[PDB]
């Protein structure tokens, strides 16, 4: 399916190449570059590009284009998810998915590509197998390697590969047995210029860090099962129990992974913790406009809102801006016309606010609409939907491991008009 892979530096350079079926000429990337030239931006590059021969499928992320070469028809998502998975793998092995990380670990990188894809069709997949086939590079490991030889490749098949539980490593051993569940909710919302909520929905994910030895069976129970509607389950989950009991029993893979992905029932309304008061004006051919925004606790759940970043995408008419924050730090970007305001947190007794005037381009026309604002924010110990976990019950192992659970609500895209 996938004949070759090119990593393209966003500056326009063939950073790295890998071939599985035949040597694909580098000239094929001319079409990619053409598309890049005809693209509005790096995020507006069409995932699928047809060329005279071969189809290109690509993923933009981490300021890097993963470009694959396809010979014959293959379901686009098959390729996309696989390719995306590869990028995630690089982050797992090197801690960061970047060209610099690769430049230092080229050999390992190249080997990983060889293990993951077999002549165009996926072979090594899940990290709990791949980590055993090729040991990840560490400082201490390289020290060992300088003595015994650079051996990071296993000489046997990971036992789990041939088991009925392939996502878990066999022979796992810890003395400090523990498990963590991080329930993170996502507030994705569209706010009207009046402050009214146009659209809002809570999505969520339960991440897990498992450090339990042997073959443990974890089981989660929730405080309000009814909040869970469209729920994606990690392959390890025996959905039949979920279906009949609504209980998450499963043999966990170790390491870090996402367990549950879900949508909160639309029957209940989404609490919006942040309101935005925003007075802004522009004038036809004026050298000056106005700006006054206040960020505060709407349905803040009685909690402190923190990790706040306020980003306004301004119209070309703006040249500069005489604007002063009541909280954190504020900088205007005249190159891309962006108001970056680092709020940090909202004090119950004192609100973050930007107050001042806008330096506009005299002779330039008034913006057809006032610029929108994206806001990042979060609350510790908060599961804003109300979804809490009722009980964790481990079977199969002798341990009384740490059973930790954390609730954090984190904003997704939060766009407010004007």
């Amino acid at each position: 399916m996938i004949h070759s892979l090119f990593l393209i530096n966003c500056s326009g350079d063939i950073f790295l190449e890998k071939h599985w079926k035949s040597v694909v000429s580098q000239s094929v990337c001319d079409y990619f570059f053409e598309a890049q030239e005809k693209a509005a931006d790096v995020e507006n590059v069409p995932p699928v590009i047809s060329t005279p021969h071969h189809y290109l499928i690509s993923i933009y992320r981490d300021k890097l284009f993963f470009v694959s070469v396809i010979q014959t028809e293959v379901p686009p998502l098959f390729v996309i998810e696989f390719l995306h998975r590869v990028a995630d793998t690089f982050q797992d092995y090197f801690g960061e998915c970047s060209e610099a990380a690769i430049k230092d670990n080229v050999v390992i990188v190249y080997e990983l590509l060889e293990e993951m894809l077999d002549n165009g069709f996926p072979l090594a997949t899940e990290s709990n197998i791949l980590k055993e086939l090729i040991k990840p590079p560490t400082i201490l490991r390289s020290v060992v390697n300088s003595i015994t030889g650079s051996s990071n490749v296993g000489d046997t098949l990971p036992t789990g590969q041939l088991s009925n539980i392939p996502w878990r490593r066999a022979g796992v051993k810890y003395t400090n047995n523990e498990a963590y569940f991080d329930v993170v909710e996502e507030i994705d919302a569209i706010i009207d210029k009046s402050g009214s909520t146009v659209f809002a929905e809570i999505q969520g994910v339960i991440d897990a860090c498992i450090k339990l030895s042997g073959m443990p069976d974890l089981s989660l129970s929730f405080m309000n099962p009814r909040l869970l509607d469209d729920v994606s389950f990690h392959p390890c989950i025996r959905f039949k129990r979920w279906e009949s009991e609504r209980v998450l029993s499963f043999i966990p893979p170790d390491g870090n992974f996402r367990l549950i992905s879900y949508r909160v029932s639309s029957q209940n309304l989404v609490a919006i913790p942040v309101y935005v008061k925003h007075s802004i004006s522009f004038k036809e051919n004026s050298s000056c406009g106005r700006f006054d925004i206040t960020i505060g606790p709407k349905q803040n759940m009685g909690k402190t809102i923190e990790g706040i970043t306020v980003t306004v995408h301004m119209p070309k008419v703006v040249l500069n801006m005489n604007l002063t924050p009541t909280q954190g730090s504020y900088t205007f970007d005249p190159v891309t016309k962006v108001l970056t305001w680092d709020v940090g947190k909202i004090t119950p007794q004192k609100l973050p606010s930007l107050k001042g005037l806008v330096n506009l381009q005299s002779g330039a026309p008034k913006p057809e609409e006032n610029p929108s604002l994206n806001i990042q924010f979060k609350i510790q110990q908060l599961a804003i939907s109300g979804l809490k976990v009722n009980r964790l019950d481990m079977y199969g192992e002798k341990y009384k491991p740490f059973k930790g659970v954390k609730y954090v609500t984190k904003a997704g895209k939060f766009q407010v008009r004007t």
């Binding site: 523990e178 963590y180 510790q380 976990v389 009980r391 964790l392 740490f402 059973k403 930790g404 659970v405 954390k406 609730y407």
Partner: peptide
């Protein structure tokens, strides 16, 4: 690392 998590 356990700090910040609730026991369950």
């Amino acid at each position: 690392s356990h700090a910040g998590y609730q026991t369950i």
